[PDB]
Design a protein around this ligand. Structure first.
Ligand SMILES: Cc1ncsc1-c1ccc(CNC(=O)[C@@H]2C[C@@H](O)CN2C(=O)[C@@H](n2cc(C3CC3)nn2)C(C)(C)C)cc1
Ligand SMILES: [Cl-]
Lengths: 149, 104, 89
């Protein structure tokens, strides 16, 4: 896995600022690029946390694993603190497509075993069942990184 | 501050924004540009309360908290046919069907 | 720069062209009368919400402002999903 934290050992102080209406799960990509869950942040809460330069974070809805943005992008990488100022990680809702937002609400109302009982075209059953997951998003980001490289 | 509105008469709904600071009369001008009817042939309503032409959208109760892109505030519209103004008639939207069994 | 989207129940929705073009389906359909699209299968309680989504999308896309949730009532969720799928937005 090309997407992994750099083992810098260079301390970096960060404010995780939840500027979303979701309970946020911070996810740290370890030195093997494997996602590690961290304590959740309620909506409209912030925390000063201890991280390191070249460490990789993404942020998800704690309950549904829906994608969230951090400083208007996918990944957050702590840098060197200048003048004892912490790095701000501003976590926001993306503008979901209306389809994805509808899939989110339907998933929140219907148990997975009952997706196939909905009066909708087969293609939408598969879309409901295609839950957001970090593993799949990391692979797309790994290809986006090599594409730019 | 931008306010986001649904201007509604009979079975017509205009989706548009304006300034919180802009006037009821200045909104009648946006309506004229789209529906080709002069301001003097227009009345605007918030619920059943007729809006005075001078008052701002802010003063009428349309703000960031009531007039949002994902949740716009309804402005009522009644036209004048020749002589006198019509009674405010906003046709409600259709009713959603009963929640499916698997969603209860 | 305003177009008309008409629901199955004959509700006429007048929205900015740039907003309606959020839908690749509506773009293709603009290629009824000029600047009018009839939706035979989308009733007013769904199409009103699609127009609200257009407003939301154009306002908050590439905005550094805090983005609020797009609310969907449970009773319209399934129909709005089918509409979203058809309109590709
Ligand atoms: C309260 C709260 N709420 C929401 S999130 C949150 C919270 C709570 C506690 C901490 C403590 N910090 C870490 O765990 C950092 C975070 C990341 O950078 C890896 N870290 C490490 O410490 C890792 N590490 C430690 C080192 C040392 C060589 C430098 N390298 N990596 C390991 C895991 C010990 C392996 C951080 C955030
Ligand atoms: Cl939800």
């Amino acid at each position: 896995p090309v997407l992994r934290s750099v083992n810098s050992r260079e301390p970096s102080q960060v404010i995780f600022c939840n500027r979303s209406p979701r309970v946020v799960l911070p996810v740290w990509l370890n030195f093997d690029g494997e996602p590690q869950p961290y304590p959740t942040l309620p909506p409209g809460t912030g925390r000063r946390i201890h991280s390191y330069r070249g460490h990789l974070w993404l942020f998800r809805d704690a309950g549904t694993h829906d994608g969230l943005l951090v400083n208007q992008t996918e990944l957050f990488v702590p840098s060197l603190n200048v003048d004892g100022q912490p790095i701000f990680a501003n976590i926001t809702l993306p503008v979901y497509t209306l389809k994805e937002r509808c899939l989110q609400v339907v998933r929140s109302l219907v148990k997975p075993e009952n997706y196939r009982r909905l009066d909708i075209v087969r293609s939408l059953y598969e879309d409901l069942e295609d839950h957001p997951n970090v593993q799949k998003d990391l692979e797309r980001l790994t290809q986006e990184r090599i594409a730019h490289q | 501050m931008d306010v986001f509105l649904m201007i509604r008469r009979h079975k017509t709904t205009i989706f548009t924004d304006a300034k919180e600071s802009s006037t009821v009369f200045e909104l009648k001008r946006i309506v004229e540009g789209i529906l080709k009817r002069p301001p003097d042939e227009q009345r605007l309503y918030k619920d059943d309360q007729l809006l005075d032409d001078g008052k701002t959208l802010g003063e009428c109760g349309f703000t960031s908290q009531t007039a949002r892109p994902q949740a716009p505030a309804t402005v009522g519209l009644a036209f004048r046919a020749d002589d006198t103004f019509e009674a405010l008639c906003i046709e409600p939207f259709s009713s959603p069907p009963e929640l499916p069994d698997v969603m209860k | 720069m305003y177009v008309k989207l008409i629901s199955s129940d004959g509700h006429e929705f007048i929205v900015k062209r740039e907003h309606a073009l959020t839908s690749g389906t509506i773009k293709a359909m603009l290629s009824n009368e000029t600047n009018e699209v009839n939706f035979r299968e989308i009733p007013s309680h769904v199409l009103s919400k699609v127009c609200m989504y257009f407003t939301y999308k154009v306002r908050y896309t590439n905005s550094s402002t805090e983005i609020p949730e797009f609310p969907i009532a449970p009773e319209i969720a399934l129909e709005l999903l089918m509409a979203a799928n058809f309109l590709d937005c």
